[PDB]
Design a protein around this ligand. Structure first.
Ligand SMILES: Nc1ncnc2c1ncn2[C@@H]1O[C@H](CO)[C@@H](O)[C@H]1O
Ligand SMILES: Nc1ncnc2c1ncn2[C@@H]1O[C@H](CO)[C@@H](O)[C@H]1O
Ligand code: PRO
Ligand code: PRO
Ligand SMILES: [Zn+2]
Ligand SMILES: [Zn+2]
Lengths: 490, 490
């Protein structure tokens, strides 16, 4: 690895995601190839998330990519926000078609007409559907793999309930899943909160969110969102039903929508990556343990070259037996030192070294990718020891990133202190009146004092400090409603 | 179900796929919503296929949807065939962009440049990648759900080998998987063969294929294809390497590509569907066994209504224990007779009836969806009996469709007999010279004698009859090369 994370981070990132074989550049801007090492992490995330929503009654399905201009517009507020980023199909071959059709940037307006068709009684609610698919949002701002791409993969869940309590409860369940994905799987700590009025989802009443902190570039980033759409879409799309116990009067369904994307893998890379390359939390790596024959003195023995391979495979088969995702790298075209480096660049949690000298003592070497720490392990304790190290690595990664968060998110009560803290490369919980104007102000202001301006991240469900009765927002003007998390951002 | 399969098949199909809740129509033509009951079958197919290719060394990945005009064209023969059906993105919002970009109709020309970048040594082969995704092929011909849609889901595998023997071997392995998917999972019999020179994949040397027979409309359909691309793409895209043991000379990789789509579910519906609705092979149904409380005489007992529910759930939990995908339909808003019909329309293999009278005798009723046959089963033999019936249903479906095939595919040696057989609503193995001209002739000719013309399906790897030395193609002109399967087709 050439660049250093601490110097040219954009160079460091572009190298780590290519030399770990995660990404490959396309000939169309802001479009990126997910090579298997990357796609496997997504599949791990998908495997977790999918089994969870299934438990909540959600079912998978698949809706068309194309949305007609009529349907796209039915919720004027929603379509306003997405309209410029929407790509439009115009011709098939040479035939310009009888209409411009839109590629989904999101699927509210593809799915919701059909929700109307499907809801005819109170019996037909709830409706809970999720789909894994690609969407397109065409922004010309300079793109970055995973973090900011023109096409990307995600899931989107869309639910519809008779009541609002039901819908309410789903929003927070989903956001807890998303929090788990970040914290249990990717070993990344997040802050759960509510988006501000400025920031919330176009259409719908409230947006909850989880935010993570990329200490390297000092910015924070949004990991996943869970929206309460209320009746906003319900009324534009005619998703209606007769309440049985309040007859004659028509009802509108309450609606949620929620999403998580491949940006997860980018956040994973930025938080955990080394000057030595990628590092993978055991819960998501394609391979957790790589077995490497080493100490082979070129031209020595062929009966021994065979006993060595046999030992490597004894290990693999035993690790497979206790559900460790293990690969034995037995290739003879590459040096042991080359293999050591290859799998380090790729971030495999544990490198397992088998050499003749070690075999003689009926034993081997386990090497942790996070700390670089070597441990000699007895051959008969191989399963239990490697389990324990993997899970210790999962823990270590998360606590390191935890403590990193805890010292880069601090409360600052005045616009003076909030500007110095924000410039030290941090994120801050300020007292905030909650107004759209005041928020637009802080953005311009913080970009003037000391090269972008801070944004609202979220209003933390569990904020650092209890906001005191006599408390002014950092604009002076209005008093403060709630401690609100602010910082520079992706 | 209104229509009859034997009368208005297009009406019968449009009803069966909507009233079974598989499909929902979109406001854009030839675009269809896969509701969960449908999407679950795909997921079953995906689960099978995926584990198999994994065993062959294939890995999953994801390439962009968009392909640039430069890359699209690099293989002139390939792009020629797909060019008119390709949809083109032209504007983002109001901004017409600096180029028209193409939506993938297939991914050879998205993936192959990157294959060149990735192959630098003989060490870098083989390269075996698969992706599950959507493609778009915009044809205005009147579309049909699953069978002929403008957007659809599929997998595509693309491999690259040093040698040709390797590539050769993969083509036939994949086609065997595809055959299994049709025969083991969907209970549909297929004929494996090689496509003719007219029909083969644009670009590349040979196309192998599996063909299935939809007796209702008398036509056949293509279920999956496995192509040998040879060096055709290799040379257009610079996918090259130095052969080590033949130094100085540059080599081109041999390439395969292969695909299977959601048309599977349409073939499944057309082959197995009833006048009573859909019917699902146990290997793929969302639910295999539906448990229904019935015989409930409205207003009778509430202690008994409770003992009944308890019994339904005893069954469910026991069936879950032996991996039977079971759902207990306990809803009180709907009649037992309504539930009976609902799940029949949806094609659930076994309906499990629990009534008070039956509970008294420590027993229940299992009802087969294919035959409609009722069996009273002891409560203690519930797991073993339901296993046996499910697998008997899988067998019954397949043998019925087998015998249906065997009597609708027959050999016919002369253009006289081939035209009468083809008009009885069948498919025929004729002696055939193999020429593109002669093939274009049969098409026009068979549409004149007796409202479409027969096409080549495939040249059966294991044809009905051994072609005799003195044998003329059905054009009179040239002698016959090989028995070739012909018929009317989707
Ligand atoms: N450019 C992007 N690349 C990947 N995910 C994105 C991108 N932009 C927004 N998202 C995701 O969009 C979802 C809601 O807009 C959020 O969860 C956010 O993570
Ligand atoms: N219209 C379609 N809908 C679904 N699959 C299709 C369609 N047309 C072609 N295919 C599939 O395309 C693959 C190769 O072209 C074949 O396996 C065929 O099954
Ligand atoms: O874009 C969003 O935030 C929501 C998530 C699901 C679909 N729309
Ligand atoms: O269209 C086809 O037939 C092949 C299958 C994989 C991609 N292209
Ligand atoms: Zn303020
Ligand atoms: Zn001929």
């Amino acid at each position: 690895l050439e660049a250093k994370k601490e110097e040219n981070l954009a160079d460091w990132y572009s190298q780590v995601i290519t030399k770990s074989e995660m990404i490959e550049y396309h000939d169309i801007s802001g479009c990126y190839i997910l090579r298997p090492w990357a796609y496997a992490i997504w599949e791990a995330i998908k495997d977790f998330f999918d089994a969870e929503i299934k438990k909540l009654g959600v079912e998978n399905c698949y809706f068309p990519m194309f949305v007609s201009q009529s349907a796209l517009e039915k919720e004027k507020t929603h379509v306003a926000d997405f309209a410029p980023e929407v790509a439009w199909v115009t011709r098939s071959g040479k035939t310009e078609l009888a209409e411009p059709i839109a590629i989904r940037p999101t699927s509210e307006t593809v799915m919701y007409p059909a929700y109307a068709k499907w809801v005819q009684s109170h019996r037909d609610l709830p409706i809970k559907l999720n789909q894994w698919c690609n969407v397109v949002r065409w922004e010309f701002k300079h793109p970055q793999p995973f973090l900011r791409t023109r096409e990307f993969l995600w899931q989107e869940g869309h639910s519809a309930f008779a009541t609002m309590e039901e819908a309410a409860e789903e929003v927070l369940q989903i956001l807890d899943l998303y929090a788990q994905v970040y914290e249990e799987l990717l070993a990344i700590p997040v802050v759960k909160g509510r988006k501000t009025e400025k920031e919330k989802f176009a259409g719908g009443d409230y947006t909850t969110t989880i935010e993570a902190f990329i200490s390297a570039s000092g910015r924070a980033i949004q990991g996943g969102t869970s929206h309460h759409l209320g009746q906003n879409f319900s009324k534009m799309f005619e998703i209606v039903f007769e309440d049985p116990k309040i007859p004659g009067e028509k009802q509108f369904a309450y609606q949620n929508s929620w999403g998580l994307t491949t940006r997860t893998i980018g956040v994973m890379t930025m938080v955990h990556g080394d000057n030595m390359g990628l590092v993978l939390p055991p819960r998501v790596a394609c391979v957790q343990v790589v077995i490497i024959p080493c100490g082979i003195t070129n031209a020595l023995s062929e009966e021994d070259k065979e006993a060595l391979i046999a030992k490597c495979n004894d290990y693999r088969r035993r690790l497979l037996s206790v559900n460790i995702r293990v690969r034995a790298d037995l290739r003879d075209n590459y040096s042991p030192g080359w293999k050591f480096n290859h799998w380090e660049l790729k971030g495999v949690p544990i490198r397992l070294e088998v050499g003749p000298r070690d075999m003689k003592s009926c034993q081997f070497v386990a090497v942790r990718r996070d700390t670089g720490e070597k441990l000699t392990v007895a051959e008969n304790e191989a399963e239990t020891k490697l389990q324990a190290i993997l899970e210790d690595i999962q823990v270590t990664l998360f606590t390191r990133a935890s403590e990193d968060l805890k010292t880069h998110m601090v409360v600052a009560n005045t616009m003076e202190d909030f500007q110095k803290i924000l410039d030290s490369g941090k994120i801050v919980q300020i007292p905030f009146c909650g107004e759209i104007d005041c928020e637009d102000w802080i953005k311009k202001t913080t970009a003037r004092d000391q090269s972008m301006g801070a944004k609202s991240l979220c209003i933390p469900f569990k904020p650092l400090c209890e906001l005191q009765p006599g408390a002014k927002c950092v604009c002076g003007k209005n008093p403060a409603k709630y401690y609100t998390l602010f910082g520079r951002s992706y």
